[PDB]
Design brief:
It catalyses: L-seryl-[protein] + ATP = O-phospho-L-seryl-[protein] + ADP + H(+); L-threonyl-[protein] + ATP = O-phospho-L-threonyl-[protein] + ADP + H(+). It is a lipid-anchor. The protein has 336 residues and is of the alpha+beta class. It has a domain of 183 residues: Transferase(Phosphotransferase) domain 1 (Transferase(Phosphotransferase), domain 1, Orthogonal Bundle). Helix content is 32%, strand content 14%. It has eleven helices and nine strands. A hairpin with a 3-residue loop joins β4 and β5. The protein is globular and about 60 Å long. The structure holds ligand I5G.
């Protein structure tokens, strides 16, 4: 099998070492509508004037990026996204920059974020949750083979595409790492114990986070929650879970082995690696190759009423895209 994961790595390393740069420019796109906003930027649905194709364009303001010390994160996201290639990872088509802003143009993923679907319809059934988890399992297998740690899994970062499959976005926090690392990033509810305990950690944190995600999909809320963020940390390093009574025996077994506080016993981090997860009884009815090739009917297909449609995202006040007459922060974004 692993003649796959070897060429995938050669390809990754070639792109990683010499990143694509300046592959389009602003006036090649018509701006239609705001899909999202953030502390340093917004995301807009745009149309390519020539091909008529729809895309999602992330527009980051260089000054705000510097203000909030996000230089390294921003650079890192673009570098990773232009280097990876996998069915469940969003596709970066173009990137470029101007006097004012950085630009990332990604294939438009129209079904919106898993977070809003989960909150719209309440907990998913086990089969529905399992379909999603399987995709994350394969995605982590891939990222891990490249020594990338994702460390940002949460419902809000999974978009649903037209066929009901997952596309992962957000790679700002992802780090290439063989060995340990220390930065404390990620939503509090998803953090593994070893991150909090500050003695270093590795890719095993992704498998913990997968456990949180499966719990949230199946239950409707995360296993470890509280008003005070200090109080969340204690719940995590303790690791006591209350499983709802509707959870099947297989699911509880899998989660006891993913929400394992000791990384050295956690599933996905042992001698058999990811296979301990794939061969778990909860995944017995899953056909791993069929999921990979997208030849499994999705349990849910988003309302998809025509190509430029944005009704799966929220509505935002539109503001102007201003380009200064003068270059800002050229030195810091030269590698972008
Ligand atoms: C609405 O947000 C998106 C929509 C996309 C569509 Cl429709 N298709 C393809 C790629 C897309 C990427 C994003 C995105 O990168 N969003 C990220 C993002 C990151 C930073 C900023 C800033 N500043 C913004 Cl506006 C969005 C955040 C937003 C959520 O927390 C989850 N990830």
């Amino acid at each position: 099998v692993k003649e796959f994961l070897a060429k995938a790595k050669e390809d990754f390393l070639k792109k990683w070492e010499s990143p694509a740069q300046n592959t389009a420019h602003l006036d090649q796109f018509e701006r239609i509508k705001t899909l999202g906003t953030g502390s340093f930027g917004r995301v807009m649905l745009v149309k390519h004037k020539e091909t008529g194709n729809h895309y999602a364009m992330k527009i980051l303001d260089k000054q705000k990026v510097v203000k909030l010390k996000q230089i390294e994160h921003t650079l890192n996201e673009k570098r990773i996204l232009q280097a990876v290639n996998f069915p469940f990872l969003v596709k970066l088509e173009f990137s470029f920059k101007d006097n004012s802003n950085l630009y990332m143009v990604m294939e438009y993923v129209p079904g919106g974020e898993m977070f809003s679907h989960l909150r719209r319809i309440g907990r998913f059934s086990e089969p529905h949750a399992r379909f999603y988890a399987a995709q994350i399992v394969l995605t982590f297998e891939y990222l891990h083979s490249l020594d990338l740690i994702y460390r940002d899994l949460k419902p809000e970062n999974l978009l649903i595409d037209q066929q009901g499959y997952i596309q992962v976005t957000d790679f700002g926090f992802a780090k290439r790492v063989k060995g340990r690392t220390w930065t404390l990033c990620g939503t509090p509810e998803y953090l593994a114990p070893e991150i909090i305990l500050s003695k270093g950690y590795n890719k095993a944190v992704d498998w913990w986070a997968l456990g949180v995600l499966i719990y949230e999909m199946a239950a409707g809320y995360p296993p470890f929650f509280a008003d005070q963020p200090i109080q969340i940390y204690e719940k995590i390093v303790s690791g006591k879970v209350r499983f709802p009574s509707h959870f099947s025996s297989d699911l509880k077994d899998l989660l006891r082995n993913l929400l394992q506080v000791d990384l050295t016993k956690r599933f996905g981090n042992l001698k058999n690696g990811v296979n301990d997860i794939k061969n778990h009884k909860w995944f017995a009815t899953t056909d791993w190759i069929a999921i990979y090739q997208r030849k499994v009917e999705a349990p849910f297909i988003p309302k998809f009423k025509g190509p430029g449609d944005t009704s799966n995202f929220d509505d935002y006040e539109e503001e102007e895209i201003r380009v200064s007459i003068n270059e800002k922060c050229g030195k810091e974004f030269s590698e972008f």
